[PDB]
């Protein structure tokens, strides 16, 4: 919904007791000063030069035009009360004549203007409390001045509506109306950009193949000269079977694409169009609107904290458990306990979870204890389905009733927690054998007759309400929180994992569903959200809520103990990105891989920088780089690790350039010494592909050998941080020191690796130190 | 207790005073009753001069 009809036309306050209808202007105004020196109606009556007002039906006086009891005069500037003598009656009279000595008999000497101290008498029109006004739109005397003039012939206009560049994201906001005015346009840029992009990805002469139609619904496979459940439109062109058109959902991302009547005899001349949907963008705008317009969507505290206002610290009146460890989950460490303890006693917390530090178990533990404060279901989100699924599984281990809500387009996708999916819980409700019967008919047929269908839908809403309303926890993606099925539902406690990977409007979709306790978990030193549109990204849409809050000065609680890396590997990132604060939950002995006879340049430090001084070159694409010498050195390192005992699927090669990634896979196929399959299972990608993932061993290929600005982890500290914190057991960087050292971050890195005597040269068999 | 006070707050204050001055010349709480036939009840505060005196 929008605001009501009787909302103050300046600030939007809509308490019936506070609003006054101007009879000429046909608009309402509250009796709060806001940021001005007088109430909003009085501001309006002076400027618009009106004198005639009416109060509101649902207010105290009922719907009464304010007028002189005696002569009917409606001029508020002449009106005031006089009281009877010794008696608690009071009438509204115009001062002259009606309220004048000779004309009267009642006490003329106690006449009191309707308009007192630049407001209507508080005891006739209520004055909005300060908390109400701090929540309203913050219009200034001057903006009213301008707005009141923009109405002299466009009465329908607002403050929001008063080209070139979009406004840049602010840190602090006057109110959520400004917040919507800033983010709203940015969200519109990403939506329009994305849509244009999707509709330009369309491809003409594609060879499709099929899977047997034994599974009822059919699959289609093809390779083009990008996510699961994305709707793709397949059209057949030619005369081997009549012109066909069908929609399918993606089930296998990549070369090969795979999408779940149709012409399964033909192979050639199909057309692929990528179907775009506004849903997530629609929902984001919706959230921004709800945030601005609905005072109940988030607590006063959270509203003011999120907008960057000064807000006094509040202790939440929750009860701490006896043991912080949740049942079903292994014991928390000192760092994680301190997080849980702290966050349960606060209305808004940020948890920073560095690589390997136990975010999910920490978040699951927090959600467990929130669940048992008993104030309805906890809402748990993450920007991505893989993160929700991971968190959903951990929460389920504690034995709470969890419902995984997902998009209707992703219901054919499997995951270890499909059995928790709402749609699957509904299917297995033996308690409603009518719904199951109607569902049998849908799945053996096309969509059902309008009577059948009304009934099915009704019972399906019932099923949904039953499961969700009784859930201890609901899990879905940030955007998924905007699902219609969760509208109409209040979430007092909300937790968002990996929030540093969503844009603010995304992250705000769930928050505006009743947040009174919000916990943002993330790491502003690892990758942030992807923003495809430069204008929007430059305007600041790439900043997350978490980040803005961190910049605002809100200090996240940091999980301090990492359990992933051998200590030598944690050392550098800890010192540079995490204030040297990371503790090692795993010892050096704990992190020698078994069946691994590899001879590190220094035996007890399993990392090194191999100097390659290859020339880079532009990939025949025209748009990237590759370094052939470096790639050669990478395969040779890959081969050594394999010979030494390492499992191929536990080797990752990270590289900033497609050209290198592409050359690197080609090279090992056509030039490795080991069997071709073995290399094929070694994952090669950008750091983006390795976010939130780990391997036993990581090789970095930096590619650049000349002076260069660079893309990727060459010039982004956050990407370097992720790059250096995927490996458990060892990491090897291959690159040109001279090229890399221009960047001060790499300079430190090289100086550190040198100081550790692990910057090396020459053949792998006889590796020596580099005297640069 | 000024808010974000503009140069156009001064103008309004002056505009409002004049407007009242101009329109004449031509011619814890306490319950009070108000005329309207119909009566309605207003809660007058102890702050006010109508309560403060009575
Ligand atoms: Zn107002
Ligand atoms: Zn008016
Ligand atoms: Zn009169």
From Swiss-Prot, chain A:
Source domain of life: Eukaryota
Residue intervals of the Upf1 CH-rich domain: 1-154
GO cellular component, one term: chromatin
UniProt keyword Nucleus, yes or no: yes
Amino acids binding ATP: 336, 356-360, 526, 563, 694
Tissue/organ expression: Ubiquitous.
Catalytic activity: ATP + H2O = ADP + phosphate + H(+)
Modification comment: Phosphorylated by SMG1; required for formation of mRNA surveillance complexes.
Binding site for Zn(2+) 2: 22, 25, 44, 50
Region C4: start-end pairs: 68-98
Residue list for modification Phosphoserine: 415
Record region (C3H): 8-40
Binding site for Zn(2+) 3: 68, 71, 94, 98
Sorted UniProt keywords: ATP-binding, Cytoplasm, Helicase, Host-virus interaction, Hydrolase, Metal-binding, Methylation, Nonsense-mediated mRNA decay, Nucleotide-binding, Nucleus, Phosphoprotein, Repeat, RNA-binding, Zinc, Zinc-finger
Enzyme Commission number: 3.6.4.12, 3.6.4.13
Location(s), subcellular: Cytoplasm; Cytoplasm, P-body; Nucleus; Cytoplasm, Perinuclear region
Stretches for region CC/SHH/C: 22-50
Residue numbers spanned by region Sufficient for interaction with RENT2: 1-265
Result for mutant: residue 356 to R: Decreases interaction with DHX34
Binding site for Zn(2+) 1: 8, 11, 30, 40
EC top class named in words: hydrolase
Effect of residue 693 to C: Abolishes NMD
Assembly: Found in a post-splicing messenger ribonucleoprotein (mRNP) complex. Associates with the exon junction complex (EJC). Associates with the SGM1C complex; is phosphorylated by the complex kinase component SGM1. Part of a complex composed of SMG1, DHX34 and UPF1; within the complex DHX34 acts as a scaffolding protein to facilitate SMG1 phosphorylation of UPF1. Interacts with UPF2. Interacts with UPF3A and UPF3B. Interacts with EST1A. Interacts with SLBP. Interacts (when hyperphosphorylated) with PNRC2. Interacts with AGO1 and AGO2. Interacts with GSPT2.
Family, as annotated: Belongs to the DNA2/NAM7 helicase family.
The protein's role, per its UniProt record: RNA-dependent helicase required for nonsense-mediated decay (NMD) of aberrant mRNAs containing premature stop codons and modulates the expression level of normal mRNAs. Is recruited to mRNAs upon translation termination and undergoes a cycle of phosphorylation and dephosphorylation; its phosphorylation appears to be a key step in NMD. Recruited by release factors to stalled ribosomes together with the SMG1C protein kinase complex to form the transient SURF (SMG1-UPF1-eRF1-eRF3) complex.
Protein name: Regulator of nonsense transcripts 1
UniProtKB/Swiss-Prot annotation, chain B:
Region (Interaction with UPF1): 4-27, 28-54
Outcome of swapping residue 34 to E: Abolishes interaction with UPF1
Disulphides: none
Tissue: Ubiquitous.
Subcellular location: Cytoplasm, Perinuclear region; Cytoplasm
Protein task: Involved in nonsense-mediated decay (NMD) of mRNAs containing premature stop codons by associating with the nuclear exon junction complex (EJC). Recruited by UPF3B associated with the EJC core at the cytoplasmic side of the nuclear envelope and the subsequent formation of an UPF1-UPF2-UPF3 surveillance complex (including UPF1 bound to release factors at the stalled ribosome) is believed to activate NMD. In cooperation with UPF3B stimulates both ATPase and RNA helicase activities of UPF1. Binds spliced mRNA.
Subunit structure: Found in a post-splicing messenger ribonucleoprotein (mRNP) complex. Associates with the exon junction complex (EJC). Interacts with SMG1, EST1A, UPF1, UPF3A, UPF3B, EIF4A1 and EIF1.
Protein name: Regulator of nonsense transcripts 2
The species this protein was found in: Homo sapiens (Human)
Gene name as annotated: UPF2
Part of the full-length chain shown: 1105 to 1198 of 1272
């Amino acid at each position: 919904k929008d605001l009501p009809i009787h909302a103050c036309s300046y600030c939007g306050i809509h308490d019936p007791a506070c609003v006054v209808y101007c009879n000429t202007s046909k608009k309402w105004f509250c009796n709060g000063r806001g940021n001005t020196s007088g109430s909003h109606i009085v501001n309006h009556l002076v400027r618009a030069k009106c004198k005639e007002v009416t109060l509101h039906k649902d207010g105290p006086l009922g719907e009464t035009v304010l007028e002189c009891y005696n002569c009917g005069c409606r001029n508020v500037f002449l009106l005031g009360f006089i009281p009877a003598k010794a008696d608690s009656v009071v009438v509204l009279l115009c001062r002259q004549p009606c309220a004048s000595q000779s004309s009267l008999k009642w006490d003329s000497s106690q006449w009191q203007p309707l308009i007192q101290d630049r407001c209507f008498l508080s005891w006739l029109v209520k004055i909005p409390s300060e908390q109400e006004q701090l929540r309203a739109r913050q219009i200034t005397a001057q903006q009213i001045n301008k707005l009141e003039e923009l109405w002299k012939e466009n009465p329908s206009a607002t403050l929001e509506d008063l080209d070139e560049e979009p406004q840049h994201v602010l840190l602090r906001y006057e109110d959520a109306y400004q917040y919507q005015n800033i983010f709203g346009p940015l969200v519109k840029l990403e939506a329009d950009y994305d849509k244009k992009l999707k509709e330009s990805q369309t491809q003409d002469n594609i060879t499709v193949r099929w899977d047997l139609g034994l599974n009822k619904k059919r699959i289609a496979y093809f390779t083009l000269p990008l996510m699961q459940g994305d709707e793709i439109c397949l059209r057949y062109k030619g005369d081997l079977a009549p012109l066909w058109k069908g929609i399918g959902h993606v089930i296998k991302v990549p070369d090969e694409i795979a999408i779940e009547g149709a012409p399964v005899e033909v192979t050639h001349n199909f057309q692929v169009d990528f179907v775009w949907k506004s849903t997530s963008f629609d929902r984001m705008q919706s959230a921004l609107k709800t945030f601005a317009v609905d005072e109940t969507s988030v607590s006063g505290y959270i509203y003011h904290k999120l907008l960057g206002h000064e807000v006094e610290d509040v202790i939440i009146k929750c009860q701490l458990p006896k043991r912080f460890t949740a049942q079903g989950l292994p014991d928390l460490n000192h760092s994680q306990v301190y997080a849980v303890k702290t966050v349960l006693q606060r209305p808004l917390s940020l948890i920073q979870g560095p690589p390997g530090t136990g975010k999910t178990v920490t978040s699951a533990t927090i959600v467990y204890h929130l669940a048992r404060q008993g104030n309805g279901p906890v809402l748990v989100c993450a920007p991505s389905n893989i993160a929700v699924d991971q968190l959903t599984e951990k929460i389920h281990q504690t034995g709470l009733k969890v419902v995984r809500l997902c998009a209707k387009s992703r219901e054919a996708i499997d995951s270890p927690v499909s059995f928790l999916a709402l749609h699957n819980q509904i299917r297995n409700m033996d308690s409603m054998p009518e719904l199951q019967k109607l569902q049998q008919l849908k799945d053996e047929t096309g969509e059902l007759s309008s009577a059948d269908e009304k009934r099915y839908r009704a019972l399906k809403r019932t099923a949904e309400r039953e499961l969700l309303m009784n859930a201890d926890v609901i899990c879905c993606t940030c955007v998924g929180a905007g699902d219609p099925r969760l509208a109409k539902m209040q979430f007092r406690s909300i937790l968002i994992d990996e929030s540093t990977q969503a844009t603010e409007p995304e992250c705000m979709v769930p928050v505006v569903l009743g947040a009174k306790q919000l916990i943002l978990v993330g790491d502003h030193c690892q990758l942030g959200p992807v923003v495809m549109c430069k204008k929007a990204a430059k305007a600041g849409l790439s900043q997350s809520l978490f980040e803005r809050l961190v910049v605002l000065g809100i200090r996240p609680i940091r999980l301090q103990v990492q359990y992933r890396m051998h200590p030598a590997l944690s050392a550098f990132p800890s010192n540079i990105f995490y204030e040297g604060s990371l503790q090692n939950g795993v010892t050096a002995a704990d992190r020698v891989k078994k069946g691994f006879d590899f001879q590190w340049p220094q035996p007890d430090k399993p990392m090194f920088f191999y100097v390659t001084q290859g020339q880079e070159e532009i990939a025949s694409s025209g748009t990237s780089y590759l370094n052939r010498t470096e790639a050669a050195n990478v395969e040779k390192i890959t081969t050594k690790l394999l010979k030494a005992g390492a499992k191929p699927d536990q080797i990752g090669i990270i590289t900033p350039y497609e050209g290198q990634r592409s050359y690197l896979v080609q090279y090992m196929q056509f030039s490795g010494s080991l069997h071709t399959k073995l290399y094929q299972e070694v994952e090669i990608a950008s750091v983006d592909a390795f976010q939130g993932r780990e391997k036993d061993f990581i090789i970095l290929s930096c590619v650049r050998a000349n002076e260069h600005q660079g893309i990727g982890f060459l010039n982004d500290p956050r990407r370097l941080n992720v790059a250096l914190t995927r490996a458990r057991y060892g990491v090897i960087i291959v690159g040109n020191p001279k090229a890399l050292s221009k960047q001060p971050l790499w300079n430190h890195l090289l100086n550190y690796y040198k100081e550790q005597k692990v910057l090396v040269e020459g053949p792998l068999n006889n590796l020596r130190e580099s005297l640069m | 207790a000024m808010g974000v006070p503009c140069v156009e707050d001064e103008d309004f204050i002056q505009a409002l005073d004049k407007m009242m001055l101009e329109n004449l010349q031509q011619r814890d709480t306490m319950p009070f009753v108000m005329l309207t036939q119909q009566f309605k009840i207003l809660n007058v505060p102890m702050s006010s001069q109508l309560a403060a005196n009575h």
